[PDB]
Amino acid sequence: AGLVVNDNDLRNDLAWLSDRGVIHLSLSTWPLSQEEIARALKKAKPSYSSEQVVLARINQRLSALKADFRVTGYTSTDQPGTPQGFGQTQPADNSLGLAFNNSGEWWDVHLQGNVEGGERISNGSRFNANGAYGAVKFWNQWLSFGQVPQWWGPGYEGSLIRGDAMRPMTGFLMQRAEQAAPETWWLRWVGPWQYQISASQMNQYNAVPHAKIIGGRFTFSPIQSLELGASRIMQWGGKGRPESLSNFWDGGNQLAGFDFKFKLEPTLGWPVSFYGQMIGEDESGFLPSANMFLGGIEGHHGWGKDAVNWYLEAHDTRTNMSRTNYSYTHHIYKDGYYQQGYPLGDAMGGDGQLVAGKVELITEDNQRWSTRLVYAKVNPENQSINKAFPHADTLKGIQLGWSGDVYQSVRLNTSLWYTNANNSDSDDVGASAGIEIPFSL
Ligand SMILES: CCCCCCCCCCCC
Ligand SMILES: CCCCCCCCCCCC
Ligand SMILES: CCCCCCCCCCCC
Ligand SMILES: CCCCCCCCCCCC
Ligand SMILES: CCCCCCCCCCCC
Ligand SMILES: CCCCCCCCCCCC
Ligand SMILES: CCCCCCCCCCCC
Ligand SMILES: CCCCCCCC
Ligand SMILES: CCCCCCCC
Ligand SMILES: CCCCCCCC
Ligand SMILES: CCCCCCCC
Ligand SMILES: CCCCCCCC
Ligand SMILES: CCCCCC
Ligand SMILES: CCCCCC
Ligand SMILES: CCCCCC
Ligand SMILES: CCCCCC
Ligand SMILES: CCCCCC
């Protein structure tokens, strides 16, 4: 029960089911309420065997994720050269995680400890409690405290406003549990809708210590084919900053924009969707300005009993696809829209252009083969505020992956990549490998 933070295997399986019309479920605001996954599963309409295979995997995964005790591990030769997608940015070359889990009807507790080797992202200590939260449920709302990662929007490679490519921040978070449409007769048109609010404290944020990220996101689906999102973030507070309830208003540094996802299955019967996101650095009342852009197209197919996932996605984190040295920059918050050098927005940082494609096959067996190509111009102004991509570079890379159960429930995750670069700080070739061991108590 409770929150379900960024998992990549889960998301792709849910997205497959959703875009094929077998379930109806928003996947553009993480973490997801499990109670909302459960509801969509109870009104699931499969018609192929491939679809029953994927379906059965959903609860199996949530059992894995929320097992009483869970040991996780990651090791690698080096940092990947290209930026990584949803659920795929590791903060160190070598990691080891121990988590105690417990949840019920009205509670979710995830006590997570991590120890690290060969830091990529800076920290106070090689020990940390990232991902660690406790949550309680009341009146269909989940209230959470901890270091919970989020994902805001329909993109697979990044969120332009609140992503994953950075250490999760300590704070409060609130959400609907079940996300049904409003009962009120004159609001029933809105459809399934969801809010997320969060107040967080930035870590080691030099230029203005203890800076807060306060934010809000709203989504709704008026028709099964269209989801619409809105989200806003303000960088606020800190040492030498106004921190009054008064100064805290909306009328700091702001980011704000919209996203959408349009499913084609309900009309053309194609298990294909397209999506977009537009976040701006300034706000013209109702619309944003100084805009970063993101768009993509995704498909989801059955083979025999196997499943195939693919997406093609383009990002532009310049200002209006031309102007540089303003995206993820600020004049008060001078370290920019980054924690410990790593972007709170898109994995690239600001002023970046990115096209990426990914295909993956998933066996009945639940082996998962993947292939990923990417082209990326990054940090053209060699901005120090971005430690993810310190230098102006053009990246042309390929990344292969394999996921599979090795022994009973012990799962192994490998990766292998090559990156053509002009001035990277990481080996042109490398390989990583992760492990998951769930235990009962
Ligand atoms: C003390 C240094 C951190 C511990 C690193 C352990 C990494 C092993 C992961 C194995 C996965 C195959
Ligand atoms: C000492 C740390 C080195 C860890 C490198 C392990 C990478 C193995 C993955 C192989 C996949 C093809
Ligand atoms: C068996 C009941 C255990 C409930 C523990 C939950 C306490 C953590 C809540 C923190 C949310 C702000
Ligand atoms: C039923 C279809 C099975 C064929 C799958 C072969 C293609 C996977 C290639 C993986 C390369 C990383
Ligand atoms: C079972 C489908 C054929 C397997 C193709 C092997 C290629 C090795 C890719 C390894 C990626 C980590
Ligand atoms: C029946 C389950 C056994 C599967 C074992 C697969 C081992 C893959 C290891 C490859 C590491 C590079
Ligand atoms: C300095 C560049 C050397 C990179 C060595 C790591 C690559 C290991 C991947 C292949 C495993 C068989
Ligand atoms: C057996 C239940 C343990 C719950 C721990 C909660 C910590 C606040
Ligand atoms: C079902 C009653 C619980 C209300 C708790 C309110 C938390 C601020
Ligand atoms: C059964 C209702 C539990 C409410 C918990 C609220 C704690 C803040
Ligand atoms: C169960 C509460 C976890 C809080 C961890 C945050 C400390 C930085
Ligand atoms: C059932 C009425 C809910 C009120 C919230 C309306 C969502 C925009
Ligand atoms: C550099 C070490 C490579 C290990 C591959 C199994
Ligand atoms: C009853 C709806 C609550 C929304 C909290 C912002
Ligand atoms: C309460 C959600 C706020 C989102 C506004 C864009
Ligand atoms: C028969 C399918 C071939 C797939 C090549 C990647
Ligand atoms: C991504 C592999 C091709 C790189 C050479 C331009």
Author numbering: 24 to 274, 288 to 477
Question: What did the authors write?
Answer:
Wzi, an integral outer-membrane protein from Escherichia coli, has been implicated in the formation of group 1 capsules. We conclude that Wzi is a novel outer-membrane lectin that assists in the formation of the bacterial capsule via direct interaction with capsular polysaccharides. Group 1 capsule-producing strains of E. coli secrete CPS into the extracellular environment when the wzi gene is knocked out, with the remaining cell-associated CPS unable to form a coherent capsule layer (Rahn et al., 2003). We propose that Wzi exposed on the surface of the cell acts as a lectin to bind to nascent EPS as it leaves the cell through the Wza translocase.
The 2.6 Å resolution structure of Wzi reveals an 18-stranded β-barrel fold with a novel arrangement of long extracellular loops that blocks the extracellular entrance and a helical bundle that plugs the periplasmic end. The X-ray structure reveals Wzi to be an 18-stranded antiparallel β-barrel, with the wall of the barrel describing a circle approximately 36 Å in diameter. Visual inspection and analysis with PISA indicates that Wzi is a monomer. The first-ordered residue is A24 (residues 1–23 are the cleaved signal peptide) and the last-ordered residue is L477 (C terminus of the mature protein). Not seen are residues 275–287, which form part of an extended loop between β9 and β10 (loop L5) and the C-terminal His tag. The barrel has a striking α-helical bundle (α1-3) that precedes the N-terminus of the first strand. The long extracellular loops—L3, L5, and L7—adopt distinct structures, parts of which fold into the barrel, whereas loops L5, L6, and L7 extend beyond the circumference of the barrel wall. The other loops are folded into the barrel and completely occlude the pore (PoreWalker [Pellegrini-Calace et al., 2009]). The lengths of the β strands are irregular; β4 is only six residues long and results in a triangular “notch” at the extracellular face of the barrel. Loops L3, L6, and L7 pack together to form a complex, positively charged electrostatic surface consistent with binding of the negatively charged sugar.
